[PDB]
C-alpha cells in the first residue's frame, strides 16, 4: 500500500526516559537518565540534575571539550557502559553549519543523542520511464543492516571533511567510482529523521545526491564494505520499498526522496502524499 | 581510586525502573525496554503487552514455534532499525542454566531482551606459588565489544547447541590453539554471575570458570584472529592490573578477582571490603 509506515518507523522515539545534553547553553543531545547518572560520576566534566546534562563551564574551546568527553567515553566504554570509540571523529553542533562545539567519537554518538550527518548517492543510468538504479547489498560483515540493500554510495560524514571530499572518498572505497564521476553528482537536497536506536537516538541528516552514471560503468566493490551491486529497473527500487524491508530502514527514504524528485511516486494518486513529504524532513 | 570492588560494583550495575517483565508460561526470562514493548505490541500474534509486562502467547506451545515467531519479529524490528541485526549464534533461553530450554534466540538480541547469557572462561596457567604466571590474551582491534582489551586465555560465549564443555574445547582450539587433549584436562572451579545495564538493554551473565595447569612448552596461537596475541605474565601483575587500571575486558575483571581468591592470591586477613567482594561475584 503506502510508503508511511518506513517514515513514520524511522521518526519513532520516545524521549521521556532521556535528559537534554547541553553546551553552553545549546541542546546538543539526549541522554538516557540511567546514563546521567554514570556520567554524574565524573563532576570535573558533567553537571547533571533531573533535567539536563550539562558539560562543565571549565571546558570552554572545542578541543578541551573534546578531550575531557573523551576520556570519560574510554572510561565507560572501558566499564561496559557505552560503546567502545573505534576512531572516526563526527562534529557536534545544533544543525549543518552551525559552529562545531566539539568532537566525538561516531560509536557514541547515538549514546549522547546528537545529530549525525551522512551522504548518500542515487547512482542511475538512463531517463524518463526507463531509469536504473545500481543498489549496493551490504557486507555481512556490516554491524548495522548486514546484508540488506543500500544505495550505491552512502556514508557517515567524518568531521574534517565537506561533504563533497566525503562523498568523493566514499565512491573511491566503496564502488570504485573515479573522482572524475564523483565530482559530477549533483546535491538534490536531504532527509532529516529522529529514531530510537538500540543504544540510543539518532536524529539524523541525510545530504542526497544524484548522478548519471555511462552506461559503461560498474561498481566494483573495493573496501568489501559492499558485498555486490545490482543494476535495477527504478519501478523495481520502488515497488521493492513498497512491499518488503529488503533496504537498510533509512535507505527506504532515500528511495522514497529519490521516486518523489523524479515523478514515480504521482500526487494524484500516492497514499499518504503530504504526510510522508512532512515526514522526510523530521 | 580504581580497585577490586569498583569493577564488581561496575559489572553490578543496573536500573530496572524503565523495563517491563519478558515472560514465557508464567516464568520471567528477561526485562524488555518500556519503548520496545510498545514496539512489539504491534506484534499481538506473539506478544501481549500490559503495562507491567510482556507475556510471549500461550499459542506457542513448543520451544521451535517460540524460536520461529520471535526470530520473525527480531527480523523486522532490526530491518526497522528497532533492535540490532541477528548474527546467526543462537542462544538458549532459561531460567537458569539447569532449568529447561524455553525457546532460542540471537546472541545479537540477547541483551534487548534482557535475557541470561551464558559462556565459559578459561584460566591457563603455568608454576606453582612464586612462580605462578598466567596466559592473558590481548583481544583484536576488530572486536565489537572490548576491542584491544585485556582476556583470558581461551573466553566465549555459549551457544544453544553445545555443552559448557564442548563449548570449552572448541574455543580452545579456535582461540588459542589448545588441542582436545590438554582442553579437557581443564576442571570447573566455580562461576560467577552479575547483572548489569549494558549499552543496548540488560545483561544478567553466567560465567562458567575452568582452571588448566599448561605445561612450560605450551604456547597459545591465535589460530581464528579473534585473539591479537598472547602474553605470559607472573599472576600478581594480572591481579594488580585488575586492582589498579581498566586494560581487562570488563567482566574478565571478575574472573581474576575468582582467581586470586580460590588460589589464596588475596587474603581476607587484610585485603579491603573482601566479603562485598566475594558477595558481589554471586550477583543477581
New interface residues.
Given amino acids: 500500500l503506502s510508503f508511511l509506515k518506513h517514515v513514520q518507523?524511522?521518526n519513532?522515539?520516545?524521549l521521556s526516559?532521556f535528559v537534554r545534553f547541553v553546551i553552553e547553553g545549546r541542546r546538543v543531545g539526549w541522554v538516557?537518565?540511567?546514563l546521567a547518572?554514570?556520567l554524574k560520576a565524573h563532576g570535573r566534566v558533567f553537571d547533571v540534575t533531573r533535567d539536563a546534562v550539562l558539560l562543565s563551564a571549565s571546558l570552554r574551546t572545542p578541543q578541551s571539550r573534546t578531550r575531557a568527553v573523551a576520556d570519560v567515553v574510554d572510561?565507560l566504554a572501558?566499564?561496559?557502559?557505552?560503546?567502545?570509540p573505534?576512531g572516526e571523529l563526527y562534529r557536534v553542533n545544533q544543525s549543518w553549519g552551525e559552529p562545531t562545539l566539539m568532537l566525538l567519537d561516531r560509536a557514541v554518538v547515538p549514546?549522547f543523542g546528537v545529530r549525525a550527518y551522512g551522504v548518500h548517492l542515487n547512482g542511475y543510468v538512463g531517463a524518463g520511464a526507463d531509469l536504473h538504479l545500481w543498489i549496493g547489498r551490504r557486507s555481512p560483515d556490516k554491524?548495522?543492516?548486514?546484508g540488506?540493500l543500500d544505495n550505491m554510495v552512502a556514508g557517515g560524514q567524518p568531521a574534517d571533511l565537506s561533504l563533497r571530499q566525503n562523498l568523493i572518498k566514499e565512491c573511491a572505497e566503496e564502488a570504485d567510482l573515479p573522482e572524475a564521476l564523483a565530482r559530477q553528482a549533483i546535491p538534490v537536497g536531504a532527509i532529516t529523521y529522529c529514531?530510537?536506536?538500540?543504544?540510543?537516538i539518532?536524529p539524523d541528516t541525510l545530504f542526497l545526491y544524484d548522478l548519471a552514471l555511462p552506461e559503461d560503468f560498474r561498481p566494483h566493490n573495493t573496501d568489501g564494505e559492499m558485498a555486490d551491486f545490482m543494476l535495477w529497473p527504478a519501478a523495481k527500487v520502488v515497488e521493492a520499498v513498497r512491499t518488503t524491508?529488503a533496504f537498510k530502514?533509512?535507505v527506504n527514504l532515500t528511495v522514497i526522496d529519490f521516486a518523489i524528485r523524479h515523478g514515480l511516486i504521482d500526487p494524484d494518486n500516492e497514499p499518504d502524499y503530504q504526510e510522508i513529504l512532512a515526514g522526510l524532513r523530521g
Fill in positions: 518507523d524511522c519513532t522515539h520516545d526516559n538516557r537518565k540511567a547518572q554514570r572510561r572501558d566499564e561496559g557502559v557505552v560503546p567502545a573505534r549514546t554491524s548495522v543492516a548486514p540488506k529514531m530510537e536506536s538500540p543504544a540510543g539518532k524491508e530502514f533509512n
